Amino acid sequence: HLACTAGIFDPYVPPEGDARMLTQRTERLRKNAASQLAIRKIREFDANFKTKDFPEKAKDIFIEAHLCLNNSDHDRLHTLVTEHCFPDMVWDLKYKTVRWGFVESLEPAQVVHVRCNMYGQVTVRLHTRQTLAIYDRFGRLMYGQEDVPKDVLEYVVFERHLMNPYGSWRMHAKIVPAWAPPKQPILKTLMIPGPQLKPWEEYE
């Protein structure tokens, strides 16, 4: 049984300078031709789905999901996110302790584009400052700063199974814009191994 589908039905293309930017909201109205028919499909099963008010509900799930990581609330996190999202979030955090906090959001969240036997997928735009610090099994710090805020802009996709009566909005994936800055480097150092050769072979 699958309650989510990997990938995005229609990939929204973020425009450079959107962070600087009413305005963008009108662009959705201009682009409602592509998305409003999709919005109707979510509305048909729900009828309370509005692009203006959806981000608040989605934002709570996104923030809550990250909070579960601090407490390792795997059971809670499963409900918050779809099955596709969960493996990425927690697999690499095994035997690690992370302190995550949410600073005030820089800009209000707004729905960006939606494209759904029926899995409604809604793209949301979020810019928020957060704090991250990950430590080793021994407690040694390996990544992030305990009390320094980092401003991150990302687009988050939630997915709900419209057909199922029990279907609910769960985070499915995050769309990363190319203009987004690179992630912070790790504290530890890595080594790129040299070419491996047999005794007969010689270095080149």
Partner: protein, 125 residues
């Protein structure tokens, strides 16, 4: 017909006719190198070489020139968990040479980010 009683024949009795045949045969790729006309067959232990000739000639209309047959002893070395010897079923291999200049060859059946490792790629923070 196998695992059945055949009617006893006495002088003046009818010819023995098997209207329905229980003998089941399978063509096998020859393990050893044999002449192309020669064909290997696995047949029930109660079937005679003459029956195979009649069987092929009547049911399958296959002309046969010569027949050679052998009985293979099944290995009983294998034992189960209870230490009871397991016997491989004994089978008879028949080498059938085709007639009328026909030649046979076995058909070809079944022709995270590298820069940031250990941190889940989901995090953008």
């Amino acid at each position: 017909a196998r695992n059945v009683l055949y009617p006893l024949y006495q002088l003046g009795g009818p010819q023995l006719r098997v209207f329905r045949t229980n003998f089941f045969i399978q063509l096998v790729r020859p393990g050893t190198a044999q002449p192309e006309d020669t064909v290997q067959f696995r047949i029930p232990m109660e079937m005679t070489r003459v029956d195979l000739r009649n069987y092929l000639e009547q049911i399958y209309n296959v002309p046969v020139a010569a027949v050679r047959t052998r009985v293979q002893h099944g290995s009983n070395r294998r034992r189960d968990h209870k230490n009871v010897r397991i016997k491989k079923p004994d089978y008879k291999v028949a080498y059938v040479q085709l007639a009328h200049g026909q030649t046979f060859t076995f058909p070809d059946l079944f022709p995270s980010d590298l820069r940031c490792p250990g941190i889940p790629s989901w995090f953008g923070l």
